[PDB]
Coordinates of C-alpha atoms and ligand atoms in Angstrom, one line a residue:
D1 CA -39.4 -16.6 -26.2
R2 CA -36.4 -15.5 -24.2
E3 CA -37.8 -12.1 -23.3
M4 CA -40.7 -13.9 -21.5
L5 CA -38.2 -15.9 -19.5
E6 CA -36.6 -12.7 -18.5
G7 CA -40.0 -11.3 -17.6
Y8 CA -40.9 -14.4 -15.6
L9 CA -37.7 -14.1 -13.6
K10 CA -38.1 -10.3 -13.1
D11 CA -41.7 -10.6 -11.9
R12 CA -41.0 -13.5 -9.7
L13 CA -37.6 -12.2 -8.3
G14 CA -37.6 -8.4 -8.6
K15 CA -34.2 -8.4 -10.4
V16 CA -33.4 -7.5 -14.0
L17 CA -31.8 -10.9 -14.9
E18 CA -30.6 -10.9 -18.6
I19 CA -30.0 -14.2 -20.3
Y20 CA -26.8 -15.0 -22.2
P21 CA -28.4 -16.5 -25.3
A22 CA -25.3 -18.5 -26.2
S23 CA -25.4 -20.2 -22.7
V24 CA -28.6 -22.1 -23.1
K25 CA -28.1 -25.9 -23.2
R26 CA -30.7 -28.7 -23.4
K27 CA -29.8 -32.1 -22.2
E28 CA -32.5 -34.8 -21.6
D29 CA -35.6 -32.7 -20.7
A30 CA -33.8 -29.9 -18.9
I31 CA -32.5 -26.4 -19.7
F32 CA -29.4 -24.7 -18.3
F33 CA -28.4 -21.1 -18.8
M34 CA -26.6 -18.2 -17.3
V35 CA -28.0 -14.7 -16.4
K36 CA -26.4 -11.4 -15.5
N37 CA -27.9 -9.0 -13.0
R38 CA -27.8 -5.6 -14.5
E39 CA -27.7 -3.9 -11.1
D40 CA -24.5 -5.4 -9.6
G41 CA -23.2 -7.6 -12.4
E42 CA -23.4 -10.9 -10.5
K43 CA -24.0 -13.9 -12.7
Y44 CA -26.2 -17.0 -11.8
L45 CA -27.0 -20.4 -13.1
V46 CA -30.7 -21.2 -13.9
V47 CA -31.9 -24.8 -14.3
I48 CA -35.4 -25.5 -15.7
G49 CA -36.8 -29.0 -15.7
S50 CA -37.6 -32.1 -13.8
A51 CA -38.0 -32.8 -10.1
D52 CA -34.7 -34.7 -9.6
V53 CA -32.5 -32.6 -11.8
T54 CA -33.4 -29.3 -10.1
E55 CA -33.0 -31.1 -6.7
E56 CA -29.2 -31.8 -7.3
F57 CA -28.4 -28.1 -7.2
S58 CA -28.1 -25.7 -4.3
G59 CA -30.5 -22.9 -5.3
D60 CA -33.7 -20.9 -4.5
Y61 CA -36.8 -22.1 -6.5
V62 CA -38.8 -19.6 -8.5
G63 CA -41.8 -21.8 -9.2
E64 CA -43.0 -23.9 -12.1
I65 CA -43.3 -22.4 -15.6
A66 CA -45.3 -24.1 -18.5
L67 CA -42.7 -25.6 -20.8
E68 CA -43.3 -26.4 -24.5
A69 CA -46.3 -31.3 -18.0
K70 CA -44.7 -28.4 -16.0
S71 CA -41.0 -27.6 -15.4
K72 CA -39.4 -26.3 -12.1
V73 CA -37.2 -23.2 -12.1
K74 CA -34.1 -23.1 -9.9
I75 CA -31.7 -20.2 -9.7
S76 CA -28.3 -21.1 -8.3
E77 CA -24.9 -19.8 -7.4
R78 CA -21.7 -20.8 -9.1
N79 CA -20.0 -22.5 -6.1
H80 CA -17.8 -25.5 -6.7
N81 CA -20.5 -28.1 -6.1
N82 CA -23.2 -26.7 -8.4
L83 CA -20.5 -26.5 -11.0
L84 CA -19.6 -30.1 -10.5
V85 CA -23.2 -31.1 -11.1
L86 CA -23.4 -28.9 -14.2
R87 CA -20.2 -30.6 -15.5
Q88 CA -22.0 -33.9 -14.9
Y89 CA -25.0 -32.8 -17.0
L90 CA -23.0 -30.9 -19.6
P91 CA -20.1 -33.4 -19.9
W92 CA -18.0 -31.3 -22.3
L93 CA -17.4 -28.9 -19.4
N94 CA -14.4 -31.1 -18.5
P95 CA -10.8 -30.7 -19.3
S96 CA -9.1 -33.1 -21.7
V97 CA -5.6 -34.0 -22.8
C98 CA -4.4 -32.2 -25.9
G99 CA -2.1 -34.7 -27.6
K100 CA 0.3 -33.9 -30.5
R101 CA -2.0 -31.3 -32.0
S102 CA -0.9 -27.7 -31.7
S103 CA -2.1 -25.7 -28.7
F104 CA -2.2 -22.2 -27.3
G105 CA -2.5 -21.3 -23.6
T106 CA -4.6 -18.2 -22.8
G107 CA -3.9 -17.8 -19.0
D108 CA -6.3 -15.6 -17.1
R109 CA -4.9 -13.8 -14.1
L110 CA -8.3 -12.3 -13.2
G111 CA -10.8 -15.2 -13.7
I112 CA -13.3 -13.2 -15.9
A113 CA -11.6 -13.5 -19.3
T114 CA -12.4 -17.0 -20.5
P115 CA -15.4 -16.1 -22.8
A116 CA -13.1 -13.7 -24.7
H117 CA -10.4 -16.4 -25.0
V118 CA -13.2 -18.6 -26.4
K119 CA -14.1 -16.0 -29.0
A120 CA -10.4 -15.8 -30.0
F121 CA -10.3 -19.6 -30.8
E122 CA -13.5 -19.4 -32.9
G123 CA -12.9 -20.8 -36.4
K124 CA -9.4 -22.1 -35.7
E125 CA -7.9 -25.6 -35.3
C126 CA -5.7 -25.2 -32.2
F127 CA -6.3 -26.9 -28.9
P128 CA -7.1 -24.2 -26.3
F129 CA -5.7 -24.3 -22.8
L130 CA -8.2 -22.2 -21.0
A131 CA -7.3 -22.9 -17.3
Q132 CA -3.7 -21.9 -17.1
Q133 CA -2.0 -20.2 -14.1
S134 CA 1.3 -20.8 -12.2
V135 CA 1.8 -21.5 -8.6
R136 CA 3.4 -18.1 -8.3
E137 CA 0.5 -16.3 -10.0
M138 CA -2.1 -18.1 -7.8
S139 CA 0.1 -17.2 -4.8
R140 CA 0.1 -13.5 -5.7
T141 CA -3.7 -13.3 -6.6
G142 CA -5.3 -15.4 -3.8
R143 CA -6.5 -18.3 -6.0
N144 CA -5.8 -22.0 -6.4
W145 CA -6.1 -24.8 -8.9
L146 CA -9.7 -25.4 -8.0
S147 CA -10.7 -21.8 -8.3
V148 CA -8.8 -21.2 -11.6
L149 CA -10.4 -24.3 -13.2
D150 CA -13.9 -23.3 -11.9
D151 CA -13.5 -19.8 -13.3
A152 CA -12.4 -21.2 -16.7
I153 CA -15.4 -23.5 -16.8
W154 CA -17.8 -20.8 -15.7
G155 CA -16.5 -18.7 -18.6
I156 CA -16.9 -21.6 -21.1
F157 CA -20.5 -22.2 -19.8
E158 CA -21.1 -18.5 -20.5
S159 CA -19.7 -18.7 -24.0
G160 CA -21.6 -21.8 -25.0
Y161 CA -18.5 -23.7 -26.2
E162 CA -18.8 -27.5 -26.4
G163 CA -15.3 -28.3 -27.8
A164 CA -12.3 -29.6 -26.0
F165 CA -10.1 -27.5 -23.7
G166 CA -7.2 -28.0 -21.4
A167 CA -6.1 -27.1 -17.9
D168 CA -2.4 -26.5 -17.4
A169 CA -0.8 -26.7 -13.9
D170 CA 1.7 -24.1 -15.0
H171 CA 5.3 -24.1 -13.6
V172 CA 4.8 -26.4 -10.7
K173 CA 7.8 -27.2 -8.5
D174 CA 7.0 -29.2 -5.4
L175 CA 5.1 -32.5 -5.3
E176 CA 2.4 -31.1 -2.9
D177 CA 1.3 -28.6 -5.5
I178 CA 1.3 -31.4 -8.1
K179 CA -1.0 -33.4 -5.7
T180 CA -3.4 -30.5 -5.4
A181 CA -3.5 -30.1 -9.2
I182 CA -4.2 -33.8 -9.5
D183 CA -7.1 -33.5 -7.1
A184 CA -8.6 -30.6 -9.1
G185 CA -8.5 -32.7 -12.3
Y186 CA -5.9 -30.8 -14.3
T187 CA -4.9 -32.3 -17.6
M188 CA -1.3 -31.0 -18.2
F189 CA 1.4 -30.5 -15.6
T190 CA 4.3 -28.2 -16.6
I191 CA 7.1 -29.2 -14.2
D192 CA 9.8 -26.6 -13.3
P193 CA 13.3 -27.9 -12.2
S194 CA 14.9 -24.4 -11.8
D195 CA 15.7 -24.9 -8.1
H196 CA 18.2 -27.4 -9.6
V197 CA 19.3 -25.5 -12.7
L198 CA 22.9 -24.4 -12.3
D199 CA 24.0 -21.4 -14.4
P200 CA 27.6 -22.1 -15.3
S201 CA 28.6 -18.4 -15.8
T202 CA 27.9 -17.7 -12.1
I203 CA 29.4 -20.4 -9.9
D204 CA 33.1 -20.8 -9.1
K205 CA 35.0 -23.5 -11.0
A206 CA 35.4 -25.6 -7.8
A207 CA 31.7 -25.9 -7.0
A208 CA 31.0 -27.0 -10.6
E209 CA 33.7 -29.6 -10.3
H210 CA 32.2 -30.9 -7.1
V211 CA 28.6 -31.0 -8.6
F212 CA 29.8 -32.8 -11.7
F213 CA 31.8 -35.3 -9.7
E214 CA 28.7 -36.2 -7.6
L215 CA 26.5 -36.6 -10.6
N216 CA 29.0 -38.7 -12.5
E217 CA 29.7 -41.0 -9.6
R218 CA 26.0 -41.5 -9.2
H219 CA 25.1 -41.9 -12.9
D220 CA 28.4 -42.3 -14.9
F221 CA 27.5 -39.9 -17.7
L222 CA 31.0 -40.2 -19.3
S223 CA 30.8 -43.8 -20.4
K224 CA 27.2 -43.3 -21.6
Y225 CA 27.6 -40.1 -23.7
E226 CA 31.3 -39.1 -24.0
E227 CA 32.3 -39.0 -27.7
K228 CA 28.9 -40.3 -28.7
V229 CA 27.8 -39.1 -32.1
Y230 CA 24.3 -38.0 -33.0
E231 CA 23.5 -37.7 -36.7
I232 CA 20.3 -35.6 -36.9
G233 CA 19.3 -34.6 -40.4
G234 CA 22.3 -33.1 -42.2
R235 CA 24.0 -32.1 -38.9
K236 CA 26.2 -34.4 -36.8
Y237 CA 26.5 -33.7 -33.0
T238 CA 29.4 -34.9 -30.9
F239 CA 29.5 -35.0 -27.1
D240 CA 33.0 -33.7 -26.6
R241 CA 34.2 -34.0 -23.0
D242 CA 33.9 -30.3 -22.0
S243 CA 30.5 -29.7 -23.5
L244 CA 29.2 -32.8 -21.7
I245 CA 30.7 -31.7 -18.4
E246 CA 28.9 -28.3 -18.6
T247 CA 25.6 -29.8 -19.8
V248 CA 25.7 -32.2 -16.8
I249 CA 26.6 -29.4 -14.3
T250 CA 23.8 -27.3 -15.7
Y251 CA 21.0 -29.9 -16.0
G252 CA 21.7 -33.0 -13.9
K253 CA 19.9 -32.3 -10.6
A254 CA 17.2 -30.6 -12.7
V255 CA 16.6 -33.9 -14.6
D256 CA 16.7 -35.7 -11.2
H257 CA 13.9 -33.4 -10.1
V258 CA 11.9 -33.9 -13.3
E259 CA 12.2 -37.7 -12.9
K260 CA 11.0 -37.4 -9.3
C261 CA 7.9 -35.4 -10.4
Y262 CA 7.0 -37.8 -13.3
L263 CA 7.3 -40.8 -11.0
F264 CA 5.0 -39.0 -8.5
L265 CA 2.5 -38.5 -11.4
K266 CA 2.6 -42.2 -12.3
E267 CA 1.9 -43.2 -8.7
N268 CA -1.0 -40.8 -8.0
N269 CA -2.9 -39.7 -11.2
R270 CA -5.2 -42.5 -12.4
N271 CA -7.0 -40.2 -14.9
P272 CA -5.3 -39.2 -18.2
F273 CA -2.6 -36.5 -18.2
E274 CA 0.3 -35.2 -20.2
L275 CA 3.5 -33.5 -19.1
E276 CA 5.5 -30.5 -20.0
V277 CA 9.2 -30.2 -19.0
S278 CA 10.5 -26.6 -18.6
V279 CA 14.2 -25.8 -19.5
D280 CA 13.3 -22.1 -20.0
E281 CA 15.1 -20.9 -16.8
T282 CA 18.7 -21.0 -18.3
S283 CA 20.2 -17.5 -19.0
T284 CA 22.1 -19.1 -21.9
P285 CA 20.2 -20.2 -25.0
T286 CA 19.8 -24.1 -24.8
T287 CA 22.5 -25.7 -27.0
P288 CA 21.5 -28.5 -29.3
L289 CA 23.9 -30.8 -27.4
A290 CA 22.1 -30.0 -24.1
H291 CA 18.7 -30.5 -25.8
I292 CA 20.0 -34.0 -26.9
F293 CA 21.3 -34.8 -23.4
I294 CA 18.1 -33.8 -21.7
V295 CA 15.7 -35.6 -24.0
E296 CA 18.0 -38.7 -24.0
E297 CA 18.3 -38.7 -20.2
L298 CA 14.5 -38.5 -19.9
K299 CA 14.0 -41.4 -22.4
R300 CA 16.7 -43.5 -20.6
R301 CA 14.8 -43.0 -17.3
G302 CA 11.4 -43.8 -18.7
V303 CA 10.0 -40.3 -18.5
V304 CA 7.0 -39.7 -20.8
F305 CA 6.6 -36.0 -21.8
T306 CA 4.7 -34.2 -24.5
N307 CA 6.1 -30.6 -24.4
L308 CA 9.7 -29.5 -24.1
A309 CA 10.3 -25.8 -23.2
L310 CA 13.7 -24.8 -24.5
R311 CA 15.3 -21.4 -23.9
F312 CA 15.7 -20.3 -27.5
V313 CA 18.3 -17.8 -28.7
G314 CA 17.5 -14.1 -28.4
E315 CA 15.5 -12.0 -25.9
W316 CA 12.2 -13.1 -24.5
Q317 CA 11.1 -10.2 -22.1
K318 CA 7.5 -9.9 -20.9
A319 CA 5.0 -7.8 -22.8
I320 CA 7.4 -6.7 -25.6
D321 CA 8.4 -8.1 -28.9
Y322 CA 11.3 -10.5 -29.6
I323 CA 14.7 -8.8 -29.8
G324 CA 17.6 -10.3 -31.7
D325 CA 18.9 -11.7 -34.9
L326 CA 15.9 -13.3 -36.7
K327 CA 18.1 -15.6 -38.9
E328 CA 20.0 -17.1 -36.0
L329 CA 16.5 -17.6 -34.5
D330 CA 15.5 -19.3 -37.7
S331 CA 18.6 -21.5 -37.9
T332 CA 18.7 -22.6 -34.3
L333 CA 14.9 -23.3 -34.5
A334 CA 15.6 -25.5 -37.5
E335 CA 18.1 -27.3 -35.3
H336 CA 15.9 -27.8 -32.3
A337 CA 12.9 -28.9 -34.4
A338 CA 14.9 -31.4 -36.5
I339 CA 16.4 -32.9 -33.3
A340 CA 12.9 -33.0 -31.7
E341 CA 11.5 -35.1 -34.5
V342 CA 14.3 -37.7 -34.4
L343 CA 14.4 -38.0 -30.6
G344 CA 10.6 -37.8 -30.2
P345 CA 8.4 -36.6 -31.8
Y346 CA 7.2 -34.1 -29.2
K347 CA 6.1 -30.5 -29.0
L348 CA 8.3 -27.5 -28.4
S349 CA 6.9 -25.0 -25.9
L350 CA 7.4 -21.2 -26.0
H351 CA 7.3 -19.9 -22.4
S352 CA 6.9 -16.1 -22.2
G353 CA 5.6 -16.1 -25.8
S354 CA 3.0 -13.4 -25.4
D355 CA 3.5 -10.6 -28.1
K356 CA 6.6 -12.1 -29.7
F357 CA 5.0 -11.5 -33.1
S358 CA 8.3 -11.4 -35.1
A359 CA 9.4 -14.9 -34.0
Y360 CA 5.9 -16.5 -34.7
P361 CA 6.5 -16.9 -38.5
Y362 CA 9.7 -18.9 -37.9
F363 CA 7.9 -20.8 -35.2
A364 CA 4.9 -21.7 -37.5
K365 CA 7.4 -22.8 -40.2
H366 CA 9.9 -25.2 -38.5
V367 CA 7.7 -26.0 -35.4
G368 CA 4.7 -26.3 -37.7
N369 CA 1.8 -28.2 -36.0
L370 CA 3.8 -29.3 -32.9
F371 CA 3.9 -26.0 -31.1
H372 CA 2.7 -24.8 -27.7
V373 CA 2.7 -21.1 -26.9
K374 CA 1.9 -19.7 -23.3
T375 CA 0.3 -16.3 -22.8
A376 CA -1.1 -15.0 -19.4
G377 CA 0.1 -11.4 -18.9
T378 CA -1.1 -9.9 -22.2
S379 CA -4.8 -10.5 -21.3
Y380 CA -4.2 -8.5 -18.1
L381 CA -2.6 -5.8 -20.1
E382 CA -5.5 -5.6 -22.5
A383 CA -7.8 -5.5 -19.4
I384 CA -5.9 -2.5 -18.1
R385 CA -6.2 -0.9 -21.5
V386 CA -10.0 -1.2 -21.2
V387 CA -9.7 0.2 -17.6
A388 CA -7.8 3.2 -18.8
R389 CA -10.4 3.7 -21.6
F390 CA -13.4 3.8 -19.3
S391 CA -12.0 4.6 -15.7
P392 CA -9.0 6.8 -16.5
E393 CA -8.7 8.1 -13.0
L394 CA -8.5 4.6 -11.7
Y395 CA -5.8 3.8 -14.3
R396 CA -4.0 7.0 -13.2
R397 CA -3.8 5.8 -9.6
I398 CA -2.8 2.3 -10.7
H399 CA -0.1 3.8 -12.9
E400 CA 1.5 5.7 -10.1
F401 CA 1.2 2.8 -7.7
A402 CA 2.8 0.5 -10.3
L403 CA 5.8 2.7 -10.9
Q404 CA 6.3 2.6 -7.2
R405 CA 6.1 -1.2 -6.8
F406 CA 8.1 -1.8 -10.0
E407 CA 11.6 -2.2 -8.4
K408 CA 10.5 -4.8 -5.8
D409 CA 8.3 -6.7 -8.2
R410 CA 11.0 -6.9 -10.9
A411 CA 13.8 -8.3 -8.7
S412 CA 11.8 -11.6 -9.0
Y413 CA 11.8 -11.6 -12.9
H414 CA 14.3 -10.3 -15.5
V415 CA 13.7 -7.2 -17.6
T416 CA 15.6 -4.2 -19.0
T417 CA 12.7 -1.7 -18.7
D418 CA 13.9 1.8 -19.4
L419 CA 12.0 3.8 -16.8
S420 CA 13.3 7.0 -18.5
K421 CA 11.0 6.2 -21.4
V422 CA 7.8 5.9 -19.4
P423 CA 5.8 8.9 -20.5
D424 CA 5.0 11.5 -17.9
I425 CA 1.2 11.1 -17.4
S426 CA 0.5 14.3 -15.4
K427 CA 0.2 15.9 -18.9
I428 CA -1.5 13.1 -20.8
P429 CA -5.2 13.7 -21.5
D430 CA -7.5 10.9 -20.1
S431 CA -8.4 10.1 -23.7
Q432 CA -4.8 9.1 -24.6
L433 CA -4.2 7.2 -21.3
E434 CA -5.1 3.8 -22.9
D435 CA -2.5 4.5 -25.7
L436 CA 0.4 4.2 -23.3
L437 CA -0.4 0.5 -22.9
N438 CA 1.3 0.6 -26.3
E439 CA 4.6 1.9 -25.0
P440 CA 6.8 -1.1 -24.1
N441 CA 8.3 0.1 -20.8
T442 CA 4.9 1.0 -19.4
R443 CA 3.7 -2.4 -20.7
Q444 CA 6.4 -4.1 -18.6
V445 CA 5.7 -2.0 -15.4
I446 CA 2.0 -2.8 -15.5
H447 CA 2.7 -6.4 -16.4
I448 CA 4.8 -7.5 -13.5
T449 CA 3.1 -5.5 -10.7
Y450 CA -0.3 -7.2 -11.2
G451 CA -0.2 -8.9 -7.8
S452 CA 0.5 -5.7 -5.8
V453 CA -2.4 -3.8 -7.5
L454 CA -4.7 -6.8 -7.2
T455 CA -4.1 -7.2 -3.5
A456 CA -3.2 -3.7 -2.3
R457 CA -5.0 -2.8 1.0
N458 CA -5.8 0.6 2.5
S459 CA -5.6 1.4 6.2
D460 CA -9.3 1.0 7.0
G461 CA -9.2 -2.5 5.3
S462 CA -10.6 -1.5 1.9
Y463 CA -8.8 -2.4 -1.3
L464 CA -7.1 0.2 -3.4
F465 CA -8.0 -1.1 -6.8
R466 CA -9.4 -4.7 -6.9
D467 CA -13.0 -3.8 -6.4
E468 CA -13.0 -0.7 -8.7
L469 CA -11.2 -2.7 -11.3
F470 CA -13.6 -5.6 -11.4
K471 CA -16.6 -3.2 -11.3
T472 CA -15.2 -1.3 -14.4
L473 CA -14.4 -4.6 -16.2
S474 CA -18.0 -5.8 -15.5
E475 CA -19.7 -2.6 -16.7
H476 CA -17.9 -2.8 -20.0
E477 CA -18.0 -6.5 -20.6
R478 CA -18.1 -6.7 -24.4
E479 CA -15.4 -4.0 -24.6
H480 CA -13.1 -6.2 -22.5
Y481 CA -14.1 -9.3 -24.5
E482 CA -13.4 -7.7 -27.9
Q483 CA -10.0 -6.4 -26.7
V484 CA -8.7 -9.6 -25.2
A485 CA -10.2 -11.8 -28.0
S486 CA -8.9 -9.8 -30.9
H487 CA -5.4 -9.7 -29.4
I488 CA -5.3 -13.5 -28.8
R489 CA -6.6 -14.0 -32.3
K490 CA -3.8 -11.8 -33.6
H491 CA -1.5 -14.3 -31.9
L492 CA -3.2 -17.4 -33.3
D493 CA -3.3 -15.8 -36.8
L494 CA 0.4 -15.0 -36.9
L495 CA 1.0 -18.6 -35.8
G496 CA -0.4 -20.1 -39.0
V497 CA -3.6 -21.6 -37.4
Ligands
ZN501 ZN1 13.6 -30.7 -5.8
ZN502 ZN1 9.0 -20.5 -17.8

């Protein structure tokens, strides 16, 4: 019985240690499970079995229990090395390349949301990317590739999931971060070339002339593409001189950067990987001609990629729904998908796709089974909703602090938040506080200030919210899980999977 394991541990340790029944695994003659301490919420690994298995873990022994010969009990902490050995014994706890099947990325800014994300994918065919954070997010939350992957795998171990998952090195720019991500075993690298994306509506004409002249002297794009026709499906696309000049000015050094990154990956990653190229940064929606140019330049240079992240028409602001003409969205999506199949095939990636419910149907029609969708912030928003539900004074303080940090934390993104429409909370009854994580502007304000709240210090050195927030989220674990899981499952449902 499980209850007699809990009683064995309690009598031999003096701690109420409750077993996640879904965590128990049995490989060879050994047993691995997770337990939660109901006093402080800390979680621990427990290994039950032979002499040499239990030896390869850093842990304190609790004695030998009759099993079914006697088996040693070893309680252990989830540091990186114990987790490495656990991934040896439970070999599904390792990230794997996704392929040309559809995928969904549930990024976790907090490191405690993976089991809920697992519950969301239950019953659905859609490759899950469970370890997904950007260099910027990890910079703002004090984490790294290793810690993000370890958190994701700890969550998987809790859930009991034995299926495939992925680890996305989101929005990487410089080769040293790529190298760190290679060392941590990540399976997809989403490379960002924005440092070299050149918005044509900002620069002076002369600078654009100079940049194009350099790129054309170095690569001679004119004689390769000028007046070249591309007959994709019904449509015919012609590289007229002007359109080609502006495509080159916008994307040339960016493609140089992406080639450099892909070559770095060929020279240094022995293990399998796949690659996502991000074109999301352009303010203008990506033209079909620019799509053609980018994919053809990547092919000509030998760059293997699996995911292309176009900047599609419309508005893609964080936390809120897609704004724009749904039928232009539909038609340009037909364009981009039809071109992707002839030039590839490959997957289209929807950066900042969290909560764009209206676009999903169009995406699940033309994109079909070759889609990727990336969500990280919405999980944090649902977590803050749980916080407001159970610690409303904490949410009140966070709300004021966030309204304050908003201006500095938004100058690094791109939103049209209407601060006038943020409800006045001094009147709102603690019961209704969660409901304003339904009002779009408050959604945005909470969304982009996550780093400030998560790292805000006091004078005496204490943290304003971090500790209280994690305590609250631990005390109400299944609440948190249900919220996050049901929202992500809303996503996957509307996406046709
Ligand atoms: Zn560069
Ligand atoms: Zn992006």
